[PDB]
C-alpha cells in the first residue's frame, strides 16, 4: 500500500492527493520504525516537492508529515536534508500562515536536535535570521517553538553560536528571560546557558546584551532546571 500512497503524491485529483498525504502523516507520527518505511518507500523527495507549488491545505499536511519525519533519528534527519527539505522549510517562515509557520518551526527545531553538521546545514539554508525575527512579532505558541530551535542551534559549536549572535539572537533572548510564560523563560534560559559555554568574545556579547541582571532574577526561581541554567550561565559571565 506504501508504493501506491507514494505515487498518489503527484496525482492531479486533490482528494486522492490529500488522502495519501493524511495516510503518510499518520505513518510519519508512528515512530522511527514507521519513518524508516517512508524513507525506504521513497516518500521523502515527493513530500518535500509538495512545499513549492501546492495549495495551503496540501502544504499544512506535508509540513506536519515532514516535522514528524524530523522527530526520527539523526540518519533519518539526514535523509530529510538530502531530500532538499531545509530550503522550503526556511522559506515558509517568511510568508506562510501562522498555522504553517508553527509547523515549519517545529520541523526546524527537530532538525536542530540532530548533529552539528545538520545544525550547519540549517544555518547554510538561512534559518537563523527568520527564527530570530519570530522571537518578537510571532504568537506565544510560535515563540515557544522558535526558542527551542534557537536553544538547539546554540548547543552547536562555537562557530555556530557566533552565527546566532550575528543573526541578532542575544537581545530578544535576554528579553525572553522575563517573558509572561514560564515555558518561554525555561527555553530562553536554556538557550542563554548554551551561549554562555562559548568563547570569551561571546560571553562579552552576552554581558553587553544585559544577561547578568536578567539571570540573577532567575536564581530565585521555583523551577529547578531554570535555577541550574541561570547559575551555570552566571558562573561563565563571572569566570
Amino acid at each position: 500500500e506504501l508504493p501506491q500512497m507514494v505515487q498518489q503524491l503527484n496525482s492531479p485529483d486533490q482528494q486522492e492527493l490529500q488522502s495519501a498525504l493524511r495516510k503518510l502523516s499518520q505513518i510519519a507520527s508512528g515512530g522511527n520504525e514507521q519513518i524508516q518505511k517512508l524513507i525506504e518507500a521513497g516518500a521523502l523527495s515527493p513530500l518535500v516537492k509538495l512545499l513549492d507549488d501546492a495549495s495551503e491545505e496540501v502544504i499544512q499536511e506535508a509540513v506536519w508529515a515532514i516535522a514528524n519525519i524530523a522527530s526520527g533519528n539523526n540518519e533519518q534527519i539526514q535523509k530529510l536534508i538530502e531530500a532538499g527539505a531545509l530550503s522550503p522549510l526556511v522559506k515558509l517562515l517568511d510568508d506562510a500562515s501562522e498555522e504553517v509557520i508553527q509547523e515549519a518551526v517545529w520541523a526546524i527545531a527537530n532538525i536542530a536536535s540532530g548533529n552539528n553538521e545538520q545544525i550547519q546545514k540549517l544555518i547554510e539554508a538561512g534559518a537563523l535570521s527568520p527564527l530570530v525575527k519570530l522571537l518578537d512579532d510571532a504568537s506565544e505558541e510560535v515563540i515557544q517553538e522558535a526558542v527551542w530551535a534557537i536553544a538547539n542551534i546554540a548547543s552547536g559549536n562555537n562557530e555556530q553560536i557566533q552565527k546566532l549572535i550575528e543573526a541578532g539572537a542575544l537581545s530578544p533572548l535576554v528579553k525572553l528571560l522575563d517573558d509572561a510564560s514560564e515555558e518561554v523563560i525555561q527555553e530562553a534560559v536554556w538557550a542563554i546557558a548554551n551561549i554562555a559555554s562559548g568563547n570569551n568574545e561571546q560571553i562579552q556579547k552576552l554581558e553587553e546584551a544585559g544577561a547578568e541582571p536578567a539571570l540573577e532574577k532567575l536564581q530565585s526561581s521555583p523551577n529547578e532546571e531554570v535555577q541550574k541554567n541561570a547559575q551555570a550561565a552566571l558562573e561563565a559571565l563571572n569566570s
Binding site: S71, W106, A109, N110, S113, W148, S155, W190
Partner: peptide
C-alpha cells in the same frame, strides 16, 4: 555540557 534535546 551543551544541552541538545528532541521536541516531542
Amino acid at each position: 555540557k551543551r544541552k541538545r534535546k528532541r521536541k516531542r
